[PDB]
A paper describes a structure:
The P domains form the outermost, dimeric protrusions of NoV virions, which plays critical roles in receptor recognition and host immune responses. HuNoVs recognize human histo-blood group antigens (HBGAs) as host receptors or attachment factors that play an important role in huNoV host susceptibility.
Most residues of [name] P protein were modeled except residues S409–A415 (in B chain), due to uninterpretable local electron density maps caused by the local disorder of this highly flexible loop region. We noted that the P-loop and T-loop on the surface of DSV/[name] P protein exhibit a higher extension and the distance between the two loops becomes closer. No complex was formed by soaking native [name] P protein crystals with NA2 N-Glycan, probably due to crystal packing.
Residue numbers in the entry:
A (entry chain A): 231 to 533
B (entry chain B): 230 to 408, 413 to 533
Amino acid sequence: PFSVPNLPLNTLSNSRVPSLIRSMMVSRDHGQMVQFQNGRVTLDGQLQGTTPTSASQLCKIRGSVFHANGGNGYNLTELDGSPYHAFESPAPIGFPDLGECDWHMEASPTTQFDTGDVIKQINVKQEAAFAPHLGTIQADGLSDVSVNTNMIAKLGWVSPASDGHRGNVDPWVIPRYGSTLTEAAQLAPPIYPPGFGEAIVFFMSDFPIAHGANGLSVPCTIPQEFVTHFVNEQAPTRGEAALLHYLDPDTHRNLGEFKLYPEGFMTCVPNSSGTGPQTLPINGVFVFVSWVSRFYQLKPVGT
Amino acid sequence: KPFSVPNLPLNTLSNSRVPSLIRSMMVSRDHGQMVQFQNGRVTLDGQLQGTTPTSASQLCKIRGSVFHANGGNGYNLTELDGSPYHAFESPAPIGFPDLGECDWHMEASPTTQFDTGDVIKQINVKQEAAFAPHLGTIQADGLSDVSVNTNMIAKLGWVSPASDGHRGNVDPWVIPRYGEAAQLAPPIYPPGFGEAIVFFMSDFPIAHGANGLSVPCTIPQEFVTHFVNEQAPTRGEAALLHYLDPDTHRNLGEFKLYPEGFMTCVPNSSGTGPQTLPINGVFVFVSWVSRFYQLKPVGT
């Protein structure tokens, strides 16, 4: 039988950055379409895009240092050291999907070391030599690292694109992973609001962002622990949408009804002009009620 | 309601002490006699213990407000969500690192929106006299130019030998002195019957590590989350598990998972036990067994 985790939201992780869920929101300016590559899963537990099983794989890069044509970077592998297969995903599993910004990362050797001198503060820019789908990304801070040094890079913070094309970091934008004719076809597909007054629910987490469009806020379509739960359970999808209640376990009140679609995103009907689920407490738990049709009309949520 | 473990291959799961993928399983002659890790601590019926979080995203992070005191700067600690740290809950805030006797090199950033990376600080947390997480205070180098009462989240980057020189290596089997401290997860012992504790090993950036980059934990983080989610009553002295081969789906070895959240096997004479098993296998619950249930040896 289908289920969602019986765990309070505020103890769960964002599925795009390894940070606790701070709030829920709907978006008028950004909620018309998203194509996040992390936090992408079916309700029957098929991982999509670059989505990992574990939050510990999120926003990490692994590869071997190259020096070519006056530029330094990584020949990418998977985080476990196994080869990156370009037909399988648009980048290695857990590769960050924060588009059009600088990635300030800490890179360390994948072999035992004696001193912190082998630890490098690197900057990954999304410019001409950013080609994760082809298995190569440029990086500043690698000039003094020997060719073929195997390393793991962990995302610390992001800042506006070094080239000046965007004055802020927009956490709604995904990377351009490659430049081929069939490039958009290799991605986890776009997510649209489905109709019937429904808006996509975004789970917001704080991440270290210099000059963020929404300050520290990063949106995702499902908590990481929900991803893991679906992969674990492999529950057959038996309807067009899973009706959920958001319960307050402390007050024993039903706070709102929600719809979770086979494509792994959640909707609510925001009350009139409204912030919808943004005013709800963040320590509630989702519970599966039943399978419903796509046209099942939800009770409005919020003020 | 019925007891289960995740149907997830080990190599996709996280260490419960450091946010890194599981690389191997092992037993330990030198360190397997007693461990008291404070992270990765959970009952099979889903009670979190020590500083153990629900989410891997909470692991090895500290949150607090900068204070400046004569010759020493540090954090007044809170929980990672900004809510107050209660000593009646845990021996330190949830997700507090449990790598004892070593320097913590951490990246600290403001919890309020900022414009540039000049507010990002590289800090060093030493485990000396002013390291008092149970009292809700730690000292840190690298905070002299941060305004008092700046709220910050610090994330563990790497660890190195203690600044005071009392140890030449980082020993990942040693926990901090938190205090005495209320809510220390209790010691774990091998229970007899030829059984050795199974450690799930992950690499973390460690300068001069006793075992290089390798950090042991007693259970994968996703197992912790699964037990908290399921809240299955414990109906026996131990849960018999099979470790299944990924290609044949067949039994490679039997394990006992105890109510206290740790797992054991009987290593073959040779002695590497589960270390030679493939790391992309899955554990499956078989049945509840008695404490004296004698396991078939595992390994070469």
